[PDB]
Protein backbone atom coordinates (compact mmCIF):
# COMPACT_ATOMS: atom_id res chain seq x y z
CA UNK A 1 0.00 0.00 0.00
CA UNK A 2 2.83 2.41 -0.89
CA UNK A 3 1.96 4.52 -3.96
CA UNK A 4 -0.65 6.96 -2.56
CA UNK A 5 -4.13 7.64 -3.95
CA UNK A 6 -4.12 11.03 -5.60
CA UNK A 7 -6.03 13.62 -3.55
CA UNK A 8 -9.59 14.53 -4.54
CA UNK A 9 -8.91 17.87 -6.28
CA UNK A 10 -6.33 16.18 -8.56
CA UNK A 11 -8.61 13.25 -9.35
CA UNK A 12 -11.44 15.58 -10.30
CA UNK A 13 -9.13 17.66 -12.49
CA UNK A 14 -7.82 14.54 -14.25
CA UNK A 15 -11.34 13.28 -14.66
CA UNK A 16 -12.68 16.41 -16.39
CA UNK A 17 -9.57 16.69 -18.57
CA UNK A 18 -9.73 13.04 -19.59
CA UNK A 19 -13.40 13.62 -20.39
CA UNK A 20 -12.47 16.35 -22.90
CA UNK A 21 -9.76 14.20 -24.47
CA UNK A 22 -12.35 11.47 -24.94
CA UNK A 23 -14.80 13.86 -26.66
CA UNK A 24 -11.91 15.00 -28.85
CA UNK A 25 -11.25 11.38 -29.84
CA UNK A 26 -7.85 11.21 -28.15
CA UNK A 27 -7.01 7.63 -27.12
CA UNK A 28 -3.49 8.19 -25.75
CA UNK A 29 -2.14 11.20 -23.86
CA UNK A 30 1.35 11.90 -22.47
CA UNK A 31 2.22 13.29 -19.04
CA UNK A 32 3.83 16.29 -20.74
CA UNK A 33 0.59 16.96 -22.59
CA UNK A 34 -1.39 16.61 -19.36
CA UNK A 35 1.05 19.06 -17.76
CA UNK A 36 0.23 21.71 -20.34
CA UNK A 37 -3.55 21.22 -20.37
CA UNK A 38 -3.81 21.16 -16.57
CA UNK A 39 -0.99 23.64 -15.82
CA UNK A 40 0.45 21.01 -13.50
CA UNK A 41 4.01 19.72 -13.07
CA UNK A 42 4.50 16.64 -15.29
CA UNK A 43 6.40 14.77 -12.57
CA UNK A 44 3.35 15.16 -10.29
CA UNK A 45 1.08 13.81 -12.98
CA UNK A 46 3.26 10.73 -13.38
CA UNK A 47 3.38 10.24 -9.60
CA UNK A 48 -0.42 10.52 -9.39
CA UNK A 49 -1.23 8.31 -12.34
CA UNK A 50 1.20 5.59 -11.25
CA UNK A 51 -1.49 4.73 -8.72
CA UNK A 52 -3.25 2.98 -11.61
CA UNK A 53 -0.23 0.84 -12.61
CA UNK A 54 0.35 -0.55 -16.12
CA UNK A 55 -3.43 -0.52 -16.59
CA UNK A 56 -3.26 3.27 -16.85
CA UNK A 57 -0.63 3.19 -19.61
CA UNK A 58 -0.80 2.65 -23.37
CA UNK A 59 2.32 3.07 -25.50
CA UNK A 60 4.33 6.16 -24.68
CA UNK A 61 1.35 7.76 -22.97
CA UNK A 62 -1.61 7.04 -20.73
CA UNK A 63 -4.73 5.16 -21.76
CA UNK A 64 -7.30 7.97 -21.77
CA UNK A 65 -10.19 5.49 -21.57
CA UNK A 66 -8.71 3.31 -18.82
CA UNK A 67 -7.95 6.32 -16.63
CA UNK A 68 -11.33 7.91 -17.29
CA UNK A 69 -13.03 4.67 -16.22
CA UNK A 70 -10.82 4.10 -13.11
CA UNK A 71 -10.83 7.67 -11.83
CA UNK A 72 -14.59 7.82 -12.38
CA UNK A 73 -14.89 4.64 -10.33
CA UNK A 74 -12.97 6.21 -7.43
CA UNK A 75 -15.10 9.38 -7.70
CA UNK A 76 -18.32 7.32 -7.43
CA UNK A 77 -19.35 7.59 -11.10
CA UNK A 78 -20.29 3.90 -11.18
CA UNK A 79 -22.27 4.13 -7.95
CA UNK A 80 -26.05 4.37 -8.22
CA UNK A 81 -26.85 7.44 -6.14
CA UNK A 82 -30.24 7.59 -4.37
CA UNK A 83 -32.06 10.91 -4.34
CA UNK A 84 -35.22 12.26 -2.82
CA UNK A 85 -36.94 15.44 -3.92
CA UNK A 86 -38.75 17.66 -1.41
CA UNK A 87 -41.35 19.85 -3.08
CA UNK A 88 -43.62 18.47 -5.77
CA UNK A 89 -44.26 21.76 -7.52
CA UNK A 90 -42.96 23.07 -10.85
CA UNK A 91 -39.29 22.42 -10.16
CA UNK A 92 -39.67 19.25 -8.09
CA UNK A 93 -41.79 17.56 -10.75
CA UNK A 94 -39.45 18.68 -13.51
CA UNK A 95 -36.53 17.12 -11.62
CA UNK A 96 -38.58 13.96 -10.99
CA UNK A 97 -39.15 13.70 -14.76
CA UNK A 98 -35.59 14.58 -15.78
CA UNK A 99 -34.79 11.23 -17.39
CA UNK A 100 -31.24 11.83 -18.50
CA UNK A 101 -29.89 11.99 -14.92
CA UNK A 102 -31.23 8.46 -14.53
CA UNK A 103 -28.99 7.33 -17.40
CA UNK A 104 -26.05 8.88 -15.56
CA UNK A 105 -26.68 7.07 -12.26
CA UNK A 106 -28.90 9.41 -10.27
CA UNK A 107 -32.04 7.63 -9.10
CA UNK A 108 -34.92 9.56 -7.58
CA UNK A 109 -36.63 7.03 -5.32
CA UNK A 110 -39.01 9.33 -3.44
CA UNK A 111 -40.61 12.75 -3.71
CA UNK A 112 -42.29 14.56 -0.87
CA UNK A 113 -44.71 17.37 -0.26
CA UNK A 114 -46.89 18.82 2.51
CA UNK A 115 -49.91 19.57 0.27
CA UNK A 116 -52.78 17.03 0.72
CA UNK A 117 -53.89 17.73 -2.85
CA UNK A 118 -50.38 16.77 -4.08
CA UNK A 119 -49.70 13.76 -1.84
CA UNK A 120 -50.72 10.48 -3.50
CA UNK A 121 -50.69 11.84 -7.07
CA UNK A 122 -48.06 10.64 -9.53
CA UNK A 123 -45.15 13.08 -9.90
CA UNK A 124 -43.54 10.89 -12.55
CA UNK A 125 -43.93 7.35 -13.93
CA UNK A 126 -43.57 5.00 -10.98
CA UNK A 127 -43.10 7.90 -8.58
CA UNK A 128 -45.87 8.86 -6.19
CA UNK A 129 -45.77 11.98 -4.03
CA UNK A 130 -45.34 11.00 -0.36
CA UNK A 131 -46.30 12.94 2.74
CA UNK A 132 -43.23 14.95 3.84
CA UNK A 133 -44.07 13.93 7.40
CA UNK A 134 -42.42 10.66 6.38
CA UNK A 135 -39.23 12.27 5.05
CA UNK A 136 -36.84 11.42 7.91
CA UNK A 137 -38.11 7.85 8.19
CA UNK A 138 -37.76 7.27 4.45
CA UNK A 139 -34.30 8.87 4.13
CA UNK A 140 -33.06 6.68 7.01
CA UNK A 141 -34.77 3.46 5.94
CA UNK A 142 -33.58 3.64 2.32
CA UNK A 143 -30.13 5.06 2.95
CA UNK A 144 -30.86 8.08 0.72
CA UNK A 145 -27.66 9.97 -0.11
CA UNK A 146 -28.82 13.16 -1.82
CA UNK A 147 -31.72 15.46 -0.99
CA UNK A 148 -33.05 17.84 -3.65
CA UNK A 149 -34.68 20.89 -2.17
CA UNK A 150 -37.42 22.28 -4.39
CA UNK A 151 -39.56 24.15 -1.90
CA UNK A 152 -39.97 27.93 -1.53
CA UNK A 153 -37.20 29.86 0.26
CA UNK A 154 -39.25 30.14 3.44
CA UNK A 155 -39.08 26.43 4.30
CA UNK A 156 -35.73 25.56 2.63
CA UNK A 157 -33.58 25.83 5.75
CA UNK A 158 -36.06 23.72 7.73
CA UNK A 159 -36.18 21.03 5.08
CA UNK A 160 -32.37 21.04 4.86
CA UNK A 161 -32.02 20.51 8.62
CA UNK A 162 -34.50 17.59 8.52
CA UNK A 163 -32.56 15.99 5.65
CA UNK A 164 -29.18 16.24 7.35
CA UNK A 165 -30.75 15.06 10.66
CA UNK A 166 -32.06 12.04 8.75
CA UNK A 167 -28.58 11.23 7.45
CA UNK A 168 -28.54 12.92 4.02
CA UNK A 169 -24.94 13.23 2.71
CA UNK A 170 -25.42 16.09 0.26
CA UNK A 171 -28.03 18.55 -0.95
CA UNK A 172 -28.89 19.94 -4.38
CA UNK A 173 -30.66 23.20 -3.64
CA UNK A 174 -33.09 24.98 -6.01
CA UNK A 175 -34.50 27.35 -3.38
CA UNK A 176 -33.34 31.01 -3.74
CA UNK A 177 -31.63 31.02 -0.38
CA UNK A 178 -28.26 29.92 0.95
CA UNK A 179 -28.82 26.98 3.26
CA UNK A 180 -26.61 26.50 6.30
CA UNK A 181 -25.90 22.87 7.03
CA UNK A 182 -22.87 20.69 7.68
CA UNK A 183 -23.24 18.60 4.53
CA UNK A 184 -22.07 19.86 1.14
CA UNK A 185 -24.58 21.86 -0.92
CA UNK A 186 -24.75 22.59 -4.66
CA UNK A 187 -27.15 25.35 -5.64
CA UNK A 188 -29.00 25.76 -8.89
CA UNK A 189 -30.59 29.16 -9.43
CA UNK A 190 -31.69 30.10 -12.95
CA UNK A 191 -31.85 33.77 -11.91
CA UNK A 192 -28.24 33.69 -10.63
CA UNK A 193 -27.13 31.99 -13.86
CA UNK A 194 -28.91 34.65 -15.91
CA UNK A 195 -27.23 37.39 -13.90
CA UNK A 196 -23.84 35.81 -14.65
CA UNK A 197 -24.81 35.55 -18.34
CA UNK A 198 -25.99 39.15 -18.65
CA UNK A 199 -22.95 40.49 -16.85
CA UNK A 200 -20.81 38.72 -19.47
CA UNK A 201 -22.93 40.07 -22.33
CA UNK A 202 -22.62 43.62 -21.09
CA UNK A 203 -18.93 43.14 -20.28
CA UNK A 204 -18.20 42.50 -24.01
CA UNK A 205 -19.07 46.13 -24.85
CA UNK A 206 -16.06 48.45 -25.34
CA UNK B 1 -15.35 37.96 -11.47
CA UNK B 2 -18.99 37.52 -12.55
CA UNK B 3 -19.85 34.28 -10.70
CA UNK B 4 -18.61 35.54 -7.30
CA UNK B 5 -20.34 38.92 -7.61
CA UNK B 6 -23.65 37.26 -8.35
CA UNK B 7 -23.18 34.93 -5.35
CA UNK B 8 -22.84 38.00 -3.14
CA UNK B 9 -25.72 39.70 -4.87
CA UNK B 10 -28.15 36.79 -4.43
CA UNK B 11 -27.14 36.45 -0.80
CA UNK B 12 -27.42 40.16 0.00
CA UNK B 13 -30.81 40.28 -1.70
CA UNK B 14 -32.05 37.54 0.63
CA UNK B 15 -30.59 39.32 3.70
CA UNK B 16 -32.53 42.43 2.71
CA UNK B 17 -35.72 40.40 2.53
CA UNK B 18 -34.72 38.89 5.87
CA UNK B 19 -34.31 42.48 7.11
CA UNK B 20 -30.62 42.22 8.06
CA UNK B 21 -28.80 45.57 8.10
CA UNK B 22 -25.25 44.42 8.88
CA UNK B 23 -23.69 41.05 8.14
CA UNK B 24 -20.30 39.68 9.23
CA UNK B 25 -17.74 37.95 7.01
CA UNK B 26 -18.32 34.84 9.09
CA UNK B 27 -22.05 34.77 8.35
CA UNK B 28 -21.34 35.33 4.66
CA UNK B 29 -18.78 32.49 4.89
CA UNK B 30 -21.43 29.99 6.10
CA UNK B 31 -23.98 30.92 3.42
CA UNK B 32 -21.59 31.17 0.46
CA UNK B 33 -19.18 28.41 1.50
CA UNK B 34 -16.07 30.54 1.14
CA UNK B 35 -13.23 31.52 3.48
CA UNK B 36 -14.16 34.48 5.69
CA UNK B 37 -10.71 35.77 4.73
CA UNK B 38 -11.71 35.36 1.08
CA UNK B 39 -14.97 37.22 1.66
CA UNK B 40 -13.02 40.05 3.35
CA UNK B 41 -10.60 40.18 0.39
CA UNK B 42 -13.47 40.20 -2.15
CA UNK B 43 -15.57 42.85 -0.44
CA UNK B 44 -12.56 45.17 0.05
CA UNK B 45 -13.17 46.33 -3.53
CA UNK B 46 -15.86 48.67 -2.17
CA UNK B 47 -13.60 50.30 0.42
CA UNK B 48 -14.78 51.69 3.76
CA UNK B 49 -18.12 52.40 2.09
CA UNK B 50 -18.90 48.69 2.22
CA UNK B 51 -18.07 48.46 5.92
CA UNK B 52 -20.04 48.91 9.12
CA UNK B 53 -17.75 48.22 12.05
CA UNK B 54 -15.95 44.94 11.39
CA UNK B 55 -18.85 43.74 9.30
CA UNK B 56 -20.54 44.78 6.10
CA UNK B 57 -23.29 47.16 5.20
CA UNK B 58 -25.83 44.83 3.54
CA UNK B 59 -27.79 47.59 1.81
CA UNK B 60 -24.63 49.39 0.55
CA UNK B 61 -23.23 46.24 -1.01
CA UNK B 62 -26.60 45.15 -2.47
CA UNK B 63 -26.95 48.49 -4.26
CA UNK B 64 -23.31 48.69 -5.43
CA UNK B 65 -23.12 45.17 -6.80
CA UNK B 66 -26.59 45.57 -8.29
CA UNK B 67 -25.09 48.56 -10.10
CA UNK B 68 -22.16 46.50 -11.38
CA UNK B 69 -24.47 43.70 -12.53
CA UNK B 70 -26.93 45.93 -14.38
CA UNK B 71 -29.87 44.57 -12.39
CA UNK B 72 -32.08 47.47 -13.47
CA UNK B 73 -32.21 46.24 -17.08
CA UNK B 74 -35.04 44.08 -18.40
CA UNK B 75 -34.06 41.17 -20.67
CA UNK B 76 -36.16 39.44 -23.32
CA UNK B 77 -35.92 35.63 -23.43
CA UNK B 78 -37.08 32.79 -25.59
CA UNK B 79 -37.07 29.10 -24.68
CA UNK B 80 -36.30 26.47 -27.32
CA UNK B 81 -37.83 23.14 -26.35
CA UNK B 82 -41.25 22.92 -24.74
CA UNK B 83 -40.70 19.64 -22.93
CA UNK B 84 -40.11 18.97 -19.24
CA UNK B 85 -37.33 21.51 -18.64
CA UNK B 86 -38.62 24.14 -21.08
CA UNK B 87 -42.11 24.07 -19.57
CA UNK B 88 -40.50 24.30 -16.14
CA UNK B 89 -38.51 27.43 -17.10
CA UNK B 90 -41.58 28.97 -18.75
CA UNK B 91 -43.45 28.61 -15.48
CA UNK B 92 -40.65 29.93 -13.30
CA UNK B 93 -42.24 33.26 -12.42
CA UNK B 94 -39.74 34.83 -10.00
CA UNK B 95 -37.16 35.30 -12.76
CA UNK B 96 -39.85 37.30 -14.58
CA UNK B 97 -40.06 39.50 -11.48
CA UNK B 98 -36.27 39.90 -11.59
CA UNK B 99 -36.36 41.28 -15.12
CA UNK B 100 -35.92 38.21 -17.27
CA UNK B 101 -39.07 38.04 -19.34
CA UNK B 102 -39.88 35.02 -21.51
CA UNK B 103 -41.89 36.15 -24.52
CA UNK B 104 -41.74 33.01 -26.61
CA UNK B 105 -41.21 29.27 -26.51
CA UNK B 106 -40.59 26.91 -29.39
CA UNK B 107 -40.82 23.24 -30.29
CA UNK B 108 -40.76 21.00 -33.37
CA UNK B 109 -43.48 18.70 -32.04
CA UNK B 110 -47.03 19.16 -33.48
CA UNK B 111 -48.54 17.65 -30.31
CA UNK B 112 -46.89 20.52 -28.42
CA UNK B 113 -47.16 23.33 -30.98
CA UNK B 114 -50.31 25.41 -30.49
CA UNK B 115 -50.82 24.34 -26.89
CA UNK B 116 -49.91 26.59 -23.97
CA UNK B 117 -46.66 26.02 -22.06
CA UNK B 118 -47.53 28.58 -19.37
CA UNK B 119 -50.25 31.16 -18.61
CA UNK B 120 -50.29 33.64 -21.50
CA UNK B 121 -47.57 31.77 -23.37
CA UNK B 122 -48.31 29.56 -26.40
CA UNK B 123 -45.77 27.16 -27.97
CA UNK B 124 -44.52 28.19 -31.39
CA UNK B 125 -43.12 26.11 -34.23
CA UNK B 126 -39.31 26.09 -33.91
CA UNK B 127 -39.21 26.70 -37.66
CA UNK B 128 -40.07 30.33 -36.83
CA UNK B 129 -37.31 30.69 -34.20
CA UNK B 130 -34.99 33.06 -36.09
CA UNK B 131 -37.85 35.13 -37.44
CA UNK B 132 -39.22 35.60 -33.95
CA UNK B 133 -35.85 36.42 -32.43
CA UNK B 134 -35.15 39.15 -35.01
CA UNK B 135 -38.65 40.65 -34.98
CA UNK B 136 -38.90 40.81 -31.22
CA UNK B 137 -35.32 41.88 -30.51
CA UNK B 138 -34.82 38.84 -28.26
CA UNK B 139 -31.59 39.05 -26.24
CA UNK B 140 -31.31 35.67 -24.48
CA UNK B 141 -31.97 32.21 -25.81
CA UNK B 142 -32.63 29.40 -23.37
CA UNK B 143 -31.77 25.99 -24.81
CA UNK B 144 -33.97 23.21 -23.44
CA UNK B 145 -33.64 20.56 -26.17
CA UNK B 146 -31.70 17.25 -26.00
CA UNK B 147 -27.89 17.33 -26.30
CA UNK B 148 -28.06 16.01 -29.88
CA UNK B 149 -29.81 19.15 -31.18
CA UNK B 150 -28.38 21.81 -28.86
CA UNK B 151 -25.42 22.92 -30.99
CA UNK B 152 -27.54 23.55 -34.09
CA UNK B 153 -30.18 25.44 -32.04
CA UNK B 154 -27.34 27.52 -30.61
CA UNK B 155 -26.19 28.22 -34.16
CA UNK B 156 -29.70 29.25 -35.22
CA UNK B 157 -29.94 31.60 -32.22
CA UNK B 158 -26.62 33.23 -32.93
CA UNK B 159 -27.36 33.77 -36.64
CA UNK B 160 -30.61 35.48 -35.57
CA UNK B 161 -28.75 37.99 -33.37
CA UNK B 162 -29.05 36.43 -29.89
CA UNK B 163 -26.69 38.12 -27.43
CA UNK B 164 -26.33 35.26 -24.95
CA UNK B 165 -27.38 31.68 -24.35
CA UNK B 166 -28.57 29.84 -21.23
CA UNK B 167 -28.02 26.15 -21.97
CA UNK B 168 -29.71 23.25 -20.15
CA UNK B 169 -28.42 20.52 -22.52
CA UNK B 170 -25.60 18.30 -21.22
CA UNK B 171 -23.15 19.27 -23.94
CA UNK B 172 -20.62 22.00 -24.46
CA UNK B 173 -21.96 24.53 -26.95
CA UNK B 174 -19.57 26.31 -29.35
CA UNK B 175 -20.75 29.79 -30.38
CA UNK B 176 -19.29 33.34 -30.27
CA UNK B 177 -21.86 34.80 -27.81
CA UNK B 178 -21.54 34.14 -24.06
CA UNK B 179 -23.00 30.85 -22.81
CA UNK B 180 -24.00 29.88 -19.27
CA UNK B 181 -24.77 26.22 -18.63
CA UNK B 182 -27.18 24.70 -16.16
CA UNK B 183 -26.62 20.97 -16.13
CA UNK B 184 -28.51 19.32 -13.29
CA UNK B 185 -26.60 16.08 -13.77
CA UNK B 186 -23.21 17.85 -13.77
CA UNK B 187 -24.11 19.76 -10.58
CA UNK B 188 -25.10 16.44 -8.98
CA UNK B 189 -21.78 14.95 -10.11
CA UNK B 190 -19.84 17.83 -8.53
CA UNK B 191 -21.81 17.27 -5.32
CA UNK B 192 -21.04 13.52 -5.29
CA UNK B 193 -17.31 14.26 -5.71
CA UNK B 194 -17.37 16.20 -2.42
CA UNK B 195 -19.52 13.53 -0.74
CA UNK B 196 -16.97 10.92 -1.74
CA UNK B 197 -14.08 13.08 -0.49
CA UNK B 198 -15.81 13.59 2.90
CA UNK B 199 -16.41 9.87 3.28
CA UNK B 200 -12.76 8.91 2.70
Author numbering:
A (entry chain B): 3 to 208
B (entry chain A): 9 to 208
Paper excerpt:
The Rex family members are well-conserved transcription factors to control the respiratory pathway, which senses changes in the redox state according to the intracellular NAD+/NADH balance. When the reduced NADH level is elevated, NADH is bound to a Rex protein, causing it to dissociate from the Rex DNA operator. TmRex forms a homodimer, and each monomer was composed of two distinct domains: the N-terminal domain involved in DNA binding and the C-terminal domain involved in NAD binding, which were linked by a flexible loop (residues 78–83). The last helix α9 of the C-terminal domain was mainly responsible for dimerization through the formation of a hydrophobic interface by extending to between the N- and C-terminal domains of the other subunit.
Subsequently, the native structure of apo TmRex was refined to 2.0 Å resolution with crystallographic Rwork and Rfree values of 20.40% and 25.83%, respectively. The refined model contained four TmRex subunits which formed two homodimers in an asymmetric unit. One dimer formed by subunits A and B was well ordered because of crystal contact stabilization, and the residues 4–208 in the subunit A and the residues 9–208 in the subunit B were interpretable. However, the N-terminal domains of the other dimer, formed by subunits C and D, were poorly ordered (average B-factors 79.6 Å2 and 73.1 Å2, respectively). Particularly, the glycine-rich loop comprising residues 55–63 was not visible due to the lack of electron-density maps. The initial structure of the apo TmRex was determined at 2.8 Å resolution using selenomethionine-based single-wavelength anomalous dispersion (SAD) data set collected at the selenium peak (0.9791 Å). The refined models of TmRex contained either two independent dimers (apo and NAD+-bound forms) or one dimer (NADH-bound form) in each asymmetric unit.
